[PDB]
Amino acid sequence: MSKTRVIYPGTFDPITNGHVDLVTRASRMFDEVVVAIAIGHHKNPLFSLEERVALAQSSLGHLSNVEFVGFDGLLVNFFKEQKATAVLRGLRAVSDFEYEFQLANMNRQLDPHFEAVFLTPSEQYSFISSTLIREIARLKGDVTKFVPQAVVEAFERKHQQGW
Numbered sequence: 001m002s003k004t005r006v007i008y009p010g011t012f013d014p015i016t017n018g019h020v021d022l023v024t025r026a027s028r029m030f031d032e033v034v035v036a037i038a039i040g041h042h043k044n045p046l047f048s049l050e051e052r053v054a055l056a057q058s059s060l061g062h063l064s065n066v067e068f069v070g071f072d073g074l075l076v077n078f079f080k081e082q083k084a085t086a087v088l089r090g091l092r093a094v095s096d097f098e099y100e101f102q103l104a105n106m107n108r109q110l111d112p113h114f115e116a117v118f119l120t121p122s123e124q125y126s127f128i129s130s131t132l133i134r135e136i137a138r139l140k141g142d143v144t145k146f147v148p149q150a151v152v153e154a155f156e157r158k159h160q161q162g163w
């Protein structure tokens, strides 16, 4: 009867309705869910860590078993420090299934306790990529159908500088 705690890592740059669906499904099946935002120092996210955490808190903060934290370093060290039972990842028709096996199997070799669980989002999110959403917003299209309203406003406010 001990508690389950799953980590859901990603760059969440920005959070999308697909991610929302996923976390909502995970929060129904596990006792605690950690939205783990990889800081992305060598990798350059469009939105800062503070913006990405805050956008995630506004979409998901009404679920009381979901926490929000930024991390860097190795996923397996974070997993250990957090006392996690597993890491969750999203699998979609558009997923690199073989890349997920690779991450799961390498991380198990770094830490034999590591465990990975996969959820599959509602089919209507099956085809949304964060890359395409950034590209649509960058070319001034409308992203309302793909992301929460707070993210739509964040793209205007990003645009209210040069962008």
Ligand SMILES: CC(C)(COP(=O)(O)OP(=O)(O)OC[C@H]1O[C@@H](n2cnc3c(N)ncnc32)[C@H](O)[C@@H]1OP(=O)(O)O)[C@@H](O)C(=O)NCCC(=O)NCCS
Pocket: 009, 010, 011, 012, 013, 014, 016, 018, 019, 038, 073, 074, 075, 076, 090, 103, 106, 107, 121, 125, 128, 129, 130, 131
């Ligand atoms: C952070 C980490 C989990 C990477 O996960 P990932 O599979 O690349 O997915 P992301 O972290 O990129 O999170 C969402 C992203 O996936 C895609 N994505 C996945 N599910 C999505 C959804 N439901 N809706 C929209 N986009 C989605 C997007 O294109 C987006 O990528 P982008 O912003 O880089 O374009 C992994 O890099 C990591 O663990 N890093 C820490 C370092 C480490 O331990 N490395 C060694 C492991 S052996």
